Structures are given as C-alpha cells and as structure tokens.
Amino acid sequence: NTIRVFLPNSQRTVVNVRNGMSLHDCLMKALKVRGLQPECCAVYRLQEKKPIGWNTDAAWLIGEELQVEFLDHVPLTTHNF
C-alpha cells in the first residue's frame, strides 16, 4: 500500500503505509535517506495543496499524492533548557 510523495527540488519517493502508522512514521526513513527531517518540513495533501499534520493517520491517505516542503528559515524561539 504505497503513497506517492513529492519532495523539494523536484524529488519524489514512494512510501509504504501500514494501518495506524502516522505520516511522520511513514515518511521518516524516506526523508532521512535524502538528508531531510520531518521536523524541518511541512506536508500537504494534493486535492491544490491542503496542509495536514505529521500525526495524520497515513492509512486514510492511501491513493492520494502528498507534497513535502521545507519550512521557511526564520529563527525559532530559544529552547535550550
């Protein structure tokens, strides 16, 4: 049960989905092997780009195309403690 995921810089990957798996868990490895972390990105369902969260249950998205974008490079609030 595969989902098509478009990535930044014209890249693209297919990921496998099991029931209950979150989007984060479904995409973690496919992003890691391309040098990307979900925490640095936003994800969308193509339907237009509709934003969805990283805790979306990916089983409901089988059959759709998703898109991953980098978050804009703006400073984060300090969290060192």
Residue set of the binding site = 79
Binding residues for Zn(2+): 79
Query: Is 42:31 a contact under the CB 8 Å cutoff?
Result: no
Q: What is the closest distance, in whole angstroms, from the C-beta atom of residue 26 to ligand USX in the complex?
A: 18
Quote the CA–CA distance of 41 and 54 in Å, as a whole number.
Answer: 10
User: Nearest-CA neighbor of 42 among 8, 76, 1?
Assistant: 8
C-beta of 73: minimal distance to ligand USX in Å? 6
Kindly tell me which of 8 and 18 has the beta carbon lying closer to ligand USX.
8
> Measured from the CB of residue 25, what is the shortest distance to ligand USX in angstroms?
17
Closest CA to 28 of 40, 19, 44: 40
Residues found near ligand USX in the complex (CB under 6 A): 37, 39-40, 71, 73-74, 76
